[PDB]
Amino acid sequence: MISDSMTVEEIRLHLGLALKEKDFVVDKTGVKTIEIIGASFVADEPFIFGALNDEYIQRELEWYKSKSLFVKDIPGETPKIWQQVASSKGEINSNYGWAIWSEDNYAQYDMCLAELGQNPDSRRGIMIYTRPSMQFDYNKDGMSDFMCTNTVQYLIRDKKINAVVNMRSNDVVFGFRNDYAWQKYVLDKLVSDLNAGDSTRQYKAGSIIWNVGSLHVYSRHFYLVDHWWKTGETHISKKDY
Amino acid sequence: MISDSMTVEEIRLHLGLALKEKDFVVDKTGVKTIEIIGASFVADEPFIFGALNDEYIQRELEWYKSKSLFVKDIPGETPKIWQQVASSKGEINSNYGWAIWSEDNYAQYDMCLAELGQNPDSRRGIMIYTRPSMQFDYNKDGMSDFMCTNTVQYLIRDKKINAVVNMRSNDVVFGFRNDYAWQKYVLDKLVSDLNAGDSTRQYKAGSIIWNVGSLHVYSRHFYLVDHWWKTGETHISKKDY
């Protein structure tokens, strides 16, 4: 049985309620956030609030494929969020391609693939992004990058492959949208690879379950929550608002 | 806002529904299980089915405190489950005391304490049990021990410290009961230590949110689910059944 989790629509409702009642928390800079602790939902839409930027996600994908820990290797102009989090030499931790494809992180993708190809029912089919040393590594050379994704586990049931995504922190507006596109990409790729290994498998992509320690919206995005609360629209221009 | 999760009572219901419907899965030996994938619930009871063995949990606690990776150092006679999972020299991976207190695993407890003592609002107060090299370490020297707990995050909100437990696999009967006792112990200790750091803090233990990739019952325990399904009693002797 796959758990009876909330949907993205229900998450929207709870975030609206949180704002309606001034359930604010003071983030590490000093800025307000609304927040759901221990959030768990099926990622059945590719965004919660805001709009889809397919161009950006594709650049972030190409960067993950390079497995480069330097933010300058992001195609084109490096986003400001990535450069203010980088070290003095432009280095970070959270290249998710490095996490699952580098041999430096013990070949997470390949090992999970080998595991599920040998035992489709495995409960140890898992990709481990973070590491114990992250307690010291997150601010190496003055970066500020404590890996937000901990683990992603894959479970094959009824010829559908489900992903259980475990994060410590995920921003509702930018974070979820980019990270969902990534996890959906990796899920689709794992299905293809397993199917190409044996044509009788016929696996299909299943559910992505999103587990977040702190799922939050920053105060600069409150107008999106507010507008949805009043109109049901998941996006406005900050000008039209 | 702390998420509106299922309770242990609701988990019991769903597990009963799964058995009622022969929703079985063939485990790695070859034995049936019922199962909830992507389970998330508030651990508001110290067990799901079965009875509390305080004597055993105390022996396992003492072993965790020793941080010993050898199963023979478990006080008294080593449980059969522990010795069939051990390597050829009696070694394992899953001493949770080693995981959070050993300097070999980068001082998970101490670093999380320092983090939360410095910033009570932190989203990076976290203890990382598992490691990337677990892909290769799980069967070192012929052991069979792929760490079941991935991470545990701590979030202090309204002077209550909530724990978000992320596991890939947890057996409903023996697993949850022992592991909950452990996580409750660590939560209580972290509250104490933070409170002893500053008398104006006045923190309290909050909720333990349990996230499991595969939450399962083995076929040898089906009779407990079956009995609860009929009578509402969470325990019977296999003789009285």
Curated annotation (Swiss-Prot), chains A, B:
It holds the Pfam family Thymidylat_synt. The active site is at 148. It catalyses: dCMP + (6R)-5,10-methylene-5,6,7,8-tetrahydrofolate + H2O = 5-hydroxymethyl-dCMP + (6S)-5,6,7,8-tetrahydrofolate. It is an enzyme of class 2 (transferase). Signal peptide: none annotated. Keywords: Transferase. Its EC number is 2.1.2.8. GO terms for molecular function: deoxycytidylate 5-hydroxymethyltransferase activity. Belongs to the thymidylate synthase family. This is Deoxycytidylate 5-hydroxymethyltransferase. The gene is 42.
